[PDB]
Design a protein around this nucleic acid. Sequence first.
DNA 1: TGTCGCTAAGTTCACGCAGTATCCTGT
Lengths: 435, 431, 381
Amino acid sequence: TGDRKGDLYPSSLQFYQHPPTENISLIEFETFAIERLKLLKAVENLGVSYVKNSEEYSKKLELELRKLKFPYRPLHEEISDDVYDLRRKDHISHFILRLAYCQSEDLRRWFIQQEMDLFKFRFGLLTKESVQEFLKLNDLQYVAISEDEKNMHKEDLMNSSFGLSLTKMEDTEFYKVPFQAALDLVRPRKVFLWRGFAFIPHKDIVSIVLNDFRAKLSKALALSARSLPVVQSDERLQPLLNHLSHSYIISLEQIDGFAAKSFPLCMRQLHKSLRENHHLRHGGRMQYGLFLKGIGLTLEQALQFWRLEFTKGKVDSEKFDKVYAYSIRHNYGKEGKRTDYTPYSCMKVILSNPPSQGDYHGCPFRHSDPELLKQKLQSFKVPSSGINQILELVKGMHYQLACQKYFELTHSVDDCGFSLNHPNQYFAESQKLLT
Amino acid sequence: QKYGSRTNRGEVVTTYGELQGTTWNGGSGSNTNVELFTSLDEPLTKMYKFMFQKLMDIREVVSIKIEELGASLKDHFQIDEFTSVSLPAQETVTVLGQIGCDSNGKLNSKSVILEGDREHSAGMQVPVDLSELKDYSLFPGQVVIMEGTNSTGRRFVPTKLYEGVPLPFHQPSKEFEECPQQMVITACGPFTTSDTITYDALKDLIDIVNRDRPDICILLGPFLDAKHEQIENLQLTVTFEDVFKRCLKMIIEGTRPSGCHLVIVPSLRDVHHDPVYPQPPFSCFEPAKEDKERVHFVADPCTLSVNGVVIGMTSTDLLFHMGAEEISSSDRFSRILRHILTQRSYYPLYPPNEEINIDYEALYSYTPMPVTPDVFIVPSELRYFIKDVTGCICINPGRLTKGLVGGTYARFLVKSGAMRSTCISAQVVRV
Amino acid sequence: YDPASLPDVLPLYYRRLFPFYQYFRWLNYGGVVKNYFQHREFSFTLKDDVYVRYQSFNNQSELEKEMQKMCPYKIDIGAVYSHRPSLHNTVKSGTFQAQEKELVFDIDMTDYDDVRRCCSSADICPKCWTLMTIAVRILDRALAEDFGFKHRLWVYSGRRGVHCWVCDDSARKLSQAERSAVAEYLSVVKGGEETIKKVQLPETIHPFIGKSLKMVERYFEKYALVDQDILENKQCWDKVIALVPEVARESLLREFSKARSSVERWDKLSSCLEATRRYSNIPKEIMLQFCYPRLDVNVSKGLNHLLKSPFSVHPKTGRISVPIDCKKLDQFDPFSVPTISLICSELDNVRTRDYKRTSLAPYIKVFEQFLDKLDQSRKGE
DNA sequence: TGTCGCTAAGTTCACGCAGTATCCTGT
Ligand SMILES: Nc1nc2c(ncn2[C@H]2C[C@H](O)[C@@H](COP(=O)(O)OP(=O)(O)OP(=O)(O)O)O2)c(=O)[nH]1
Ligand code: SF4
Ligand SMILES: [Mg+2]
Ligand SMILES: [Zn+2]
């Protein structure tokens, strides 16, 4: 507690309930954001590669936490200034990432998962004393049976907890919880119930704590997504938060079938126009070519398709090889800088070149007038209620939610189950459902 | 060279009021109480975020300015109803608006347009024909009430131009009835010669201050002029902040013997300060503990209370700005000063001159004149003067330095409740 | 009993025998929560199998009226909703939600058919009723010891089984997930008609299973070895052999060829299993598969479930769904339960005390004691 | 401080107009 410290950061672990109120610098903002992004990406990679209970997981996660200087171990010394600093980092960075990871359901889920993993690890590193301290500071009020009552139900406790030895059991203390909170334990009969209370040992507790945490965090993310318009106006923080998640730290014949079913409405419109006129302006060409690259159409397949489609537009075949062949090669990263250009994301399509008369690119939900969108939805035999819901979502400026509702209605699924943020993601989900 | 060998040192170039001795002496700020005029509106005392003006906000600020002044004038003149400026009028109607020029050049009698407010005219404009007006004095941004007719619906023909109504003077409390007369020395930048950065004129003025021991010293910017030939061509070997800090240290430390309350007013030509009007006070200098009570970093414009005497001051060259745009039917400076007092704003010109950056929300909040000041300090590139405009003593002390040659400052005596003769005497003197 | 005589007797009963005062005391729960009785769902089944739901009533007078007017053949009690069911059409979609209901269990003899030999389908006899007698003890003990539910009303279903209403305020606020957890915790015999071995206990016996086996043991010898005679002949003991590992099966068969009594055969089976240790729980698995209650988790999971009302009349047996006193459980006889015809004969043989002159009185008395306990709990709390 | 006029071909540059070629965008 050197100059401007306090009791604001009692314990290492926290539920991240109270937002920070300080005035920080832009440099500090960026440093904290990037550092926690690195930490969360490391958590995700280690979770994919190793089993979270494995010792390799623990060693690598400790190494990453030490490298990025985040709180991971307790200290029975006092609140040293350095420690305070670290905790402050953690607290601010978390909320910054919340602002970064609340725009799309997908993102939200990802964030939640990583956060939970990190929290679990940190809990796993808490000594019993520290653990109790934590459980008190957050008003979780998990105890604790007396020794006399424990002896009273000794045999019942012994037969309740799986793989608990007599002496080892004598060395352990249980907690009394209402059975409504131990559903997952009681349901398979792995914890003793007496008079409406379950007697839960000290490995499982993390689970309950995590449940609480997850609830809270989900709620918080919802609120943050509700408070997004206030932040978008701050240009300084827009490049970061809007793009933090992306921060560096098939047969031709079946295409038509996909156009009928799998293609998102943007690609459906583009394909319909192409087959209507056998020619697409540059924007349409770029968008559709990138999408067909995303689905998997190889350079030869795409070249054949484009040749066949354009030759019908009453143009010379050699004219095609003269002009559009170079464009195709570049679209596939064959010439020039030779870069594997990624397919357009729905956000880009919304914010890409604005279509004009004679154009058909862009997101229909954003670039189609409400009457035109209503007519198109009616044409596709969408139920009137579904069309009205889609129109309402479009009027709400949440075009991604409108496309998700379209997917739900067309695939006969109550919930999409994924945060649609890429047309290729739409096609992949449709293929997964169908095939 | 030229400045150091001048021969007219101490010459009184202009005088007003009671004759005084060849030497002036003050109380050294002993029985002196200097504060910011406590009005309804809070003063500008700290930086405000700027560089973000919405055109809608500018529209609202201008419209409310016109509306408020018109409401006050309507109550004063017992005018029944205002009429939309744009609508045709076969009979005589009273119209409230603001003057402007139909083109980007300088206003002339054939290029006058009247723009109404949102309440009465939806912001519509109308050309004005000044053929039937016998006497007038108009500048862009001037809120006016006119009686006239619009027979063609396309050209307003004024027949009467209502006069301005200045705010009432301040009625001082008796708390300062027994205080003695106070001496004020006011000087305006530039403080250094065009070809030097040594601040010789400032040193001479500080010597004068210590010699005469005034009660208040009002120093108006610029203190590090942006138009200084050395500054523009990047010949300075030290940062702007360092030069300004040296200048302020010189001023404050050098005035220690005099014990004189220093009132520092920034200028739009201060290369080291935020270029926005109303200008916030200087905040890069922390006076020592022995000078905190003596130094007052005030905002541009400022309304100061000195033992009940209200002094208005602005570093902006208002007279030069408005003289280039004022058109009259037939003293020009007196007319412009009366215009400033009657419009009740320290900068009523709209659009402003090319040399001033105006944040219109801050202008709305911090340019209203609370009352009509007893003394109004208006430094100008124009000639020095001491004028009596509607009972307010308007002092232009010139600038301390005029190119390569030394300039002038002013000294005046103020006492609350004297005789309305709150200004006992005033003199524009040479440095 | 003549079921063509049902339409003749139903009104009189609903007019002079159905205990409306105590019924309202029950479903009103001491008026503590406003709109509690007014938001309760009922459903009626009328003549010719006409079903109506979303019936709600303002108070006892309205209920008595509309019931005496309709003369329903079946009365089912449902959930307490966010609004009055009668106006569910008026409630905005998604805003009509079931919020509270008693925790209920239905045990039906028909679900025991693969393991009883005396009767089948809807037939019951004194030799098989002991199974219900076991269930009530096994379950009710858990509900009184493991979960701490204090107000439990057991009711005869009229023909094939028994219902339990657990009415503690805590038990009435349990979510769907909590109900499913409670049901799965109490449930041991898992599987359908396609599975032979329906109980696979682990090495460690959970205390609940130990106490259920202790309760089973007291009755097992009479029920299974004397009455049911689950080892009478080869066609039956082949099943029990089918429930144990093949290794000893042959060893058992010869032994079962030299045994004259099924008690002797049980002793032999226990001895052989003991001699053969991970299989030391196999006899317990057999006992459970022949004695432990079967619970339809769908009956108890859903909040919106409509269950037969107490003091209903069974459309076929005519018996009254009467409460069962837990203490006198061993004396309960589902064949002596008053029928509607008997109680109408009794009624037409002699205002608020008419029922005290019929054989229905002791069951209304048990119900009144249960309601008195509920009132004591509502006050004391 | 005055430094004669106009006329005309010619060089070098800055741009229209059209034609040819290569190189792009994203996550
Ligand atoms: N202003 C002016 N005009 C000139 C100049 N040189 C030639 N001219 C014009 C005006 C002359 O009358 C005209 C005739 O030019 P010529 O070269 O044939 O000479 P000119 O005829 O005066 O006499 P000449 O041919 O020698 O007998 O050209 C000159 O230097 N200045
Ligand atoms: S949200 Fe994406 S996939 Fe859906 S129509 Fe718009 S651009 Fe296409
Ligand atoms: Mg082209
Ligand atoms: Zn039977």
